[PDB]
Amino acid sequence: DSLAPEDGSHRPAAEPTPPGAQPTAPGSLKAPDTRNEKLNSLEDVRKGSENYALTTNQGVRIADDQNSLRAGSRGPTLLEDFILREKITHFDHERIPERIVHARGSAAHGYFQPYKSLSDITKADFLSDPNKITPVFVRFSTVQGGAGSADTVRDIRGFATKFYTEEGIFDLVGANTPIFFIQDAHKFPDFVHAVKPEPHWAIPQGQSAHDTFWDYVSLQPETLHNVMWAMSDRGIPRSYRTMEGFGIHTFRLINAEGKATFVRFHWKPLAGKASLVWDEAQKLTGRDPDFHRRELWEAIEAGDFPEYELGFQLIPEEDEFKFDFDLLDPTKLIPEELVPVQRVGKMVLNRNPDNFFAENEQAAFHPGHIVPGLDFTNDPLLQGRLFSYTDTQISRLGGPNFHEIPINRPTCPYHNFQRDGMHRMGIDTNPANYEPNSINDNWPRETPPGPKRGGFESYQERVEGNKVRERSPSFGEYYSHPRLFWLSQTPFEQRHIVDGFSFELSKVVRPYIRERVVDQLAHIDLTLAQAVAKNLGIELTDDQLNITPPPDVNGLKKDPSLSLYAIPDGDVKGRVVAILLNDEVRSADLLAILKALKAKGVHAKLLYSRMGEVTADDGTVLPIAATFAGAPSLTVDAVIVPCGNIADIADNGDANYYLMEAYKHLKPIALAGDARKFKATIKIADQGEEGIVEADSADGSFMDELLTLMAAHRVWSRIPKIDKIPA
Amino acid sequence: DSLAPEDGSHRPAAEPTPPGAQPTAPGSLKAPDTRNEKLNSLEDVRKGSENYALTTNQGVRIADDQNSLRAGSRGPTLLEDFILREKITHFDHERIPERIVHARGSAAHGYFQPYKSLSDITKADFLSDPNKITPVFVRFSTVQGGAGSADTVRDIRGFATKFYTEEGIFDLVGANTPIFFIQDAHKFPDFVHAVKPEPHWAIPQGQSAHDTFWDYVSLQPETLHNVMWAMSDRGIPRSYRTMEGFGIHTFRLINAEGKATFVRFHWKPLAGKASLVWDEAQKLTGRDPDFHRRELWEAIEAGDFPEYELGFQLIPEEDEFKFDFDLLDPTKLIPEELVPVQRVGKMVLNRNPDNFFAENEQAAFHPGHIVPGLDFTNDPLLQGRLFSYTDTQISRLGGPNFHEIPINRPTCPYHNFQRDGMHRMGIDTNPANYEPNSINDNWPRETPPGPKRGGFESYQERVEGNKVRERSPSFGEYYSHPRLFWLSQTPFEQRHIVDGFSFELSKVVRPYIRERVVDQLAHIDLTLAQAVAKNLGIELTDDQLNITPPPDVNGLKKDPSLSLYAIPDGDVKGRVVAILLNDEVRSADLLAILKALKAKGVHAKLLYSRMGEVTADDGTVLPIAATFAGAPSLTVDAVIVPCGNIADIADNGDANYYLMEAYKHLKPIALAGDARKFKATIKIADQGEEGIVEADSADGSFMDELLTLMAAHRVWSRIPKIDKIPA
Ligand code: HDD
Ligand code: HDD
Structure with a gap:
């Protein structure tokens, strides 16, 4: 029965659309033409649904999915209702352990390409040819909170990229600050327990503002550098698109001649750096706890693909001891004034997953997943990390065959003598399951190290010391x-x-x-x-x-x-403006507003005091995105109030508070015509004020002023005026 | 090392203390003299810490827990460091699957006692004698959100009570509404998936405000009843202490004569019924996502034990069909005007857990866990629930030995022929692992049904009908x-x-x-x-x-x-009042204010523009609990602004906003002396208005008037006045 509306408005158009224009949908349905080798390789497990019969997991068609089987229609449910038990059993076992840390994350698919061959410094295949594309899967996250916690908390952000290269998976597992809180991995559990919800009562969630974290920090001065970054606006990024990415540790690049070059990895956000302000971020955890997840997904659906520039800080092996800090200390950053970030390539994230659980929740990233041409260093945090990411998925992903979960599979060949384990997918036909063997003529065989397509060989670093802790x-x-x-x-x-x-x-x-x-x-x-x-x-x-x-x-x-x-x-x-409508909007202002916004790729959300529609002065029917309370100023970057019948919203508490909130949070506000009467609400300036755009109508000059303000993100000069306004 | 401060301020007093006075702490340390049979039975697994050497899990003392073992102090971490590997391994596998639904929950220990013997209608041992005390473990929860989701969301609330009886565990697994959304357990996964975060992107968290929920609701009219309850203020309770509790399904009481009586279970909050208003609840998910969890814990620490009255709706077998609605339909309530709730007993929650994960997260409740004297009915939702709760803990708690997890263990004897399974704790000495046996003389043995201490026998209900879905x-x-x-x-x-x-x-x-x-x-x-x-x-x-x-x-x-x-x-x-301080508070008002509140067990929090102290007019040093921004009005029930140097905070935006927010959320506000200047902030006329207490000082009837307003919870007459106001 219960069917789609006649008009087909239940289904989102399969083309790039602005946030809010269409209901969001699984990536392969929203953008079927967006492909890459990894995305295509997932076709064996993608399952459709339209036009198929509802079945059990054993392929038996279900006649009635509304009822249990019982003796009489008011009788007891019978044990032979296998349809019911299969359905409930699967439901009862839906959950898998969340990540010990970084449980809350949002992911997307994309591709990477180097700017030029980096073969002089590294033999890594994915950086060897400018026209050789490498599929990526990237997961951004918070650190402390559960998978159900809020996005815009004050915390470090994780930035994990899985590179499906032709010579293996490379996972670049980083963060949005260039250092970590601690020096040795042995203290990870102490630090994480200290920042996590306290053990007796499990409070607070996704907050470092509690006794145990500050106790730990107070007794462990090495944490101060990352604490500084966390306490800064870096701890509350506006979007995953507007934050830096860093690998933190010094790794090595190994070229075909065996030369080792120390490297620190960087991601430069091509959309720029931008963070929220604390009051906004905190309130936003309440108004929309899924803000960063939503913003990432919608950007991708809109064609505003998150783009990052991969960059390397390169330090010659002979310069290891030339700074006043140790290169292997992950609490120490390498100042760009000392060692510039060399541009390496671009990463574009252009498609959302189909099923969050299957692809995002099950994805396993691990910093030990390197490829020939890359190598580790003795950084003692990195060292201990190598043990942990393989270990942890034995319980999180149920066993050692986690590489067989579709999202984790390499797109390149993989053959070894490893067998069995829980939920083994791969059916090996090799006569041998050990090497050396003569029965399969020793295949699959080891491969000597080499310039390209060679087996992994560790850089032969000289080790000299006593066994010490x-x-x-x-x-x-x-x-x-x-x-x-x-x-x-x-x-x-x-x-x-x-x-x-x-x-x-x-x-x-x-x-x-x-x-x-x-x-x-x-x-x-x-x-x-x-x-x-x-x-x-x-x-x-x-x-x-x-x-x-x-x-x-x-x-x-x-x-x-x-x-x-x-x-x-x-x-x-990709930024967004809240447009506060009235019931007789001056269509001329609205036209100039949208044209200007469209030219710069800025989105708009039409707000009103109720949902449904409003008709402008020229009969244009305007669909309402959300109410003033429904999509707070927190969710937008600037606010525009067009002329029209201003008396309609002039006494509206929510419309006035909308401006006060945006004003407090240093966002650009633009007032046209009689909309300038809202200036009283934000008790400020008569003539005018830097940060507030005003004019008799919304024209080219009005919109250029606003767009120039938006380019600078926030109106920092207004700081002095905000702590009097009651908002 | 010896890091606690000389003065012992790191440790909370072991006596009832109001919210925020002392650091919260594990129950056995905060209230060591508060005991019950279950709390005493947990002593075998309770572990201390003070004065003990730090060891591995195998009992080996650790000399250096700050470092990994490496070859050289800047060398590589060695695989032989088993101390590092054990500590990281435990950390790496800390998480277990959260509950499929009700993942977010707060729990406490307590006790139950019947008012009078219920032997005439039930042979259940825990209701047979007023002097019979039954230890309980209650978990309150939300439904949709994950374990790290927020507390004050709009949702149904779970209310599960584990009764550790002399004749078995009785789990009463209810909710804060008298009905459920669906009629048959076969559609549980359908309903849950519809309300949970949508599968493509896992948004939104903790909310039914999204398309799939309302899509399902619109296609399944049976859900309308519980939807009405959720949309009302019932969906956003002020605290777990101020909500009703219901078992929802019609169960049976079986007496010693074999007579079956229909029964619906009720919990009456002895602190009354009270809820938040939408804007406060939503904002409060941002300012403090652990508000309910914190409030529960702190009430118990203050000695404000959550108290509930168990009540029974009793319907004779002969009246099964006397109503307009089916008694076995869980989407239908039984109006108290038709069938009164008969008071049965009192439940007091008087101790918090020691460790949230061990006790709260691993607790397993299940409605099929009944005892002789109780029985099921054919309610089709309940019928299917019986399959689910045992099933789900095979993954959640790793196996069938979950009743051996300390919190879940019966306090009464348990012996049977079940053996092995993961994590097997009990070491059986019985020569036989089957019955009938002669080698152990058939022990343990079956016990026939009887008036007291007899075996479980189901009520011989007549079943008649065809096998139908x-x-x-x-x-x-x-x-x-x-x-x-x-x-x-x-x-x-x-x-x-x-x-x-x-x-x-x-x-x-x-x-x-x-x-x-x-x-x-x-x-x-x-x-x-x-x-x-x-x-x-x-x-x-x-x-x-x-x-x-x-x-x-x-x-x-x-x-x-x-x-x-x-x-x-x-x-x-147990309610709380925010006190907006200034730098020269009239100490007389403060003494009057604070003592009136203490007399009625109402707590106070002294707020100011910074932390530290403030000195009253007479030199009294006032300790500041939080800043105006640090403990927003959302967290209190009323606001009082004492006389003093009002110009100190008069043009403080936060203080002004504090009153605007509390005024909007219909909370009582009391202004003494020059604190009446704040009236212009909330637009209060000179003559005053119901809901605002005002006088020359905090003397006479000022506190009695304020306390009467608090008794009525919120100022519902102010609703029309909040419409405008920009807050
Ligand atoms: C010794 C243990 C260890 C240490 C010292 C670190 N972590 Fe880690 N982290 C893990 C143990 C781990 C983990 C336990 O193995 C996790 C959680 C579960 C998972 O799959 O990997 C993980 C997850 C994890 C993720 C999430 C992967 C995802 O999105 O699935 C990120 C981005 C980071 N870590 C990054 C960091 C940063 C940049 C660190 C220091 C520079 C760091 N980790 C130190
Ligand atoms: C057939 C499936 C089924 C149905 C129809 C219901 N649930 Fe349920 N319930 C679940 C299957 C389940 C579960 C999957 O088995 C859960 C998940 C975690 C667990 O231990 O039990 C659960 C847990 C669970 C808990 C939390 C126990 C705790 O705090 O650990 C509450 C209070 C209830 N639910 C209450 C109910 C009530 C009042 C519902 C309708 C009357 C209901 N559930 C219907």
Whole structure:
């Protein structure tokens, strides 16, 4: 019975559409023409549904899927109802363990291509030819929260890319900050337990603002550098598209001649760097906990493909010990002023998955999954990571055949003498299951190392030392990087860092813990220490006021690449404007607005006080995306209020608060005609004010002003005016 | 090392302490003298920590837990480091599958005691004597969200009680609404999948406001009744302590004579019925996603034990067919005006767990777990539930030995011939592992049914009919209960229902689904349908305008027990008041304020613009609990602003907004002396207005008036005033 509407409006058009225009859908139905080798290789397991009979898992057609089998229609359910038990059994066993860390993540498919051959420095096949494309699957995530936690929390973000290369899978498993909190993997469980929900009551979710995290940080100064990044606006990115990606550790590139080059991996967001502000981010976890997941999926459906530039920081083997920090210390970043990021290639994410569980939830990424031409280093965090990502999927993905889960399968050949394990898919026909063997003539065979298509051979690094459980003495420096980071931020970023620490520490119940953290801040910078201390009602002591600042990092007093906003990098394509409608919209304003927005690739969401439709002054029927309360200003980048019958929304509480919220969160607001009367609500400026666009109508000049504001992301000059507005 | 602070402030006092005064802690440490048989039985597995050496899982002392073993202090990590590998292995496999539904839940220990023997109607041992104390373990939950999802979402709430009886575990697995959405267990997966995050992208979390839920609802009218409950304020409870509890299904009570009585289980909140308002609940999912979990824990730590009264709806076997609706239909409630709830006993929750994962996450509840004196019915939803709850823990808790997990273990004896299975703890010495046997003289033995301590025998219900997959025709009525619920709500409750539907339907992207639900509502009540339709810009057709309303339920045109607020049941103990401080507070007001609150067990939180202290007019040093932004008005029940230097916070946006938010969410507000200046922030006239307490000081009747408002929960007369106001 229950069928599609007559008009076929149940199904989304299979073409790129702006966010909100059509219901979202599985990637292969939304963009059937978007292909790559990995996507095509998944065709063996994709299952359709249209025009097929409903069946059991054993292929038996079901006649009645509305009822259990029972003795009489008001009788007991019978044990022989195998249709019911199969259906319930499958339901009862739907869940699989979520990831210990990074449980909350959003993923997409894409492709990578190098700009030029990198054969002089590496024999890795995927970086050898500019016209050789490598399919990717990328998963972005948060760290602390469960798979059901919110997206816009303050946390580090994970940035994992699976490269399906012709010589094996390469997983580049990184983050959105260039360092990690700890130095040795042996302490991972301590750090993670400290930041995770506390053990007695399992609170708080997706928040570091609790006693145990700050206790750990206070006793483990090595965490301060990544804590600085977390407390900055880097901890609350606007989108996965507008954050940097870093592999954190120093790895090696190995060329065909055997030369090893130290490398640190970077991802540069081609959409620019952009973060939310704390109040916005926190409120957004409540208004839309799926904001980053939704934004990524819709960008891809709209053709606004998340694009990243892969970059390498290359350090010659002879320069290993030439910085004032150890290259193998993952709490230490390599300043771009010292070692520039060389551009390597572009990564484009152009298709969403079909089924989240099957492809995203089951995907297994592991930093040990390298290929010939790449190698590890002795970074002690990286070292311990190699043990963990293979181990963990034995329970998470049920066994050692996790490489056979469709999303994890290599697109290149794979043959070995490994057999069985739970849910073995591969049916091996090889007479032998061991080597050496004569019965299959020793196949599959080992392959000597070589310039191309060779077997993996580890770089023969000289190892010289006693068996010790000891931290390198060169890792024993914890304040210089934190301070380099602090001094590289703009004044408004520095305040946001202050506010982040002050907010977090205010949630720490034990006051001595707050004081210990403030003491640690005094070893980084007294201006910073004092600003936090004042917000906590703490007085720095005389000894604290006399702590000598840490040395500069190899002479650097700052490095602007560490700031999100010091150097403009603002792209408006893919951003969204909230348009506040009224019941007699001036169609001339609306036309100029959409044309201008369309030219720059900026989307629009038409909002009103109710759903359904509104008719403009020229009879144009405008479908309403959401109500003012339904899609808060949190969800958009700027707000436009066109002229029309302004008296319709002039006394609307939600319409007024929409502007106050956007204003508080430093977003550009544009008011046309009688819409300028909303200026009173945001008690500010008579003549005008930088950040607020105004004119008698919405024209070319009005829209160019707004788009220029959006290019700079937020109106930082308005900071001084926001802490009086009651919003 | 010796890192605790000399002064012992790291450790919370082991005595009842109000919320926020001390760091929360594991139950056995916070309240060591609070015991019961189950808590004492868990002593064999409880593990301490203080004064013990740090070891591996095999008992080997660890010398250095900061480092991995490597060849050289900057060398590679060695495979022989078994201390590293064991610690990472345990960490790597910490997670277990979350529950398929109700993954998000908060639990506590407690006890139950009947008021009088129920031997005349049931031979269940736990109800046979008023002096018989039964230890309980209760878990409250949401339904849709994952374990890391938020607490104050709009959803049904789970309410599961594990009764550790002398004759077996009795699990009463209910919810906070008297009905469920579907009629037959075979459609459970259908309904759940429809409400859960959509499969392509896994959005949205913790919400039924999406197309697939409303698609299903519109095609399955049986769901309308529970949908009505969810859309009302019942879907967003103030706390687990202030919601009702129901078993939903009609079960049987069996006495010693063999007589069967139909019974529906009820839980009455002794703190009363109380819910949030939509905007507060949604915002509160952002400001504190653990609000219910925290509130439950802290109430128990303050000694404000959640107390519930078990009640029975009793229906004689001869009255099975005397109602308009089928007694076995779970989408139908039994109106208390027809069948009164008879008070049976009291449940007190007085101790939190020690470890959330071990006790809360691994607890397994199942409604098939009944004891002699209770029995099932043919309710088709219940029938299928009996299959599911044993089945699901084979994956969730790793096997069939899940009753051996400490929290799940019976306190009474258990002996049988079941053996082996993963994680087998019990070491059986019985020579026989089968019955009948002679080698152990047939022990353990079967026990015949009898008045007390006898074997389980099912009630010999007559079964007659053909083997059919068929819904009983008596279940085919879908609108009369929904309508009864609608008509029993107050006008502001009805507005809130209209608002829930309107908001949820606005998040449904396909307009035709919205229209179809509107068509269903028009079968329930025209006023309701029209109001929702208006908010969605949908016009009812003339046909929809003349749909004749469903008949009354057995002559009833309303039943006031179905309303949260129609019949007052306001309890103020355990509620919390925000106190907006200034830098020269009038200490006399503060003393009057704080003592009046303490007298009624109402908690307070002293807030300010920063942390630290503030000095009152007489030099009294006031400890600040949180900042205005740090503990938003969403978390409190009322706000008081004492006299003092009001100009200190008068132009503080946050303080002003605090009052705007609380005013909007209908909470009592009290302003003393110059704190009346804030009236212009909330637009209060000079003469005052109901819901706002105001006077020259906090003396006389100021606190009694404020406490009367708190007793009535929220100021429902202010609804019309909140319409405008930009907050
Ligand atoms: C020693 C253990 C260890 C340590 C020291 C790290 N983690 Fe890790 N992390 C794991 C143990 C692990 C894990 C336990 O193996 C996980 C979770 C489950 C999974 O599959 O892998 C994982 C997941 C995981 C993911 C999610 C993969 C996904 O999206 O599926 C990311 C992006 C990171 N990690 C990145 C980091 C960063 C950049 C780290 C340091 C630089 C780091 N990990 C340290
Ligand atoms: C046939 C399937 C079935 C049906 C029709 C129901 N559920 Fe259920 N229930 C599940 C299958 C299940 C489950 C999959 O077996 C769960 C998941 C986790 C578990 O242990 O039990 C569960 C758990 C579960 C819990 C959480 C126990 C805890 O806190 O651990 C609550 C309170 C209930 N549900 C309540 C109910 C009620 C009031 C429902 C309707 C009357 C209902 N469920 C219908």
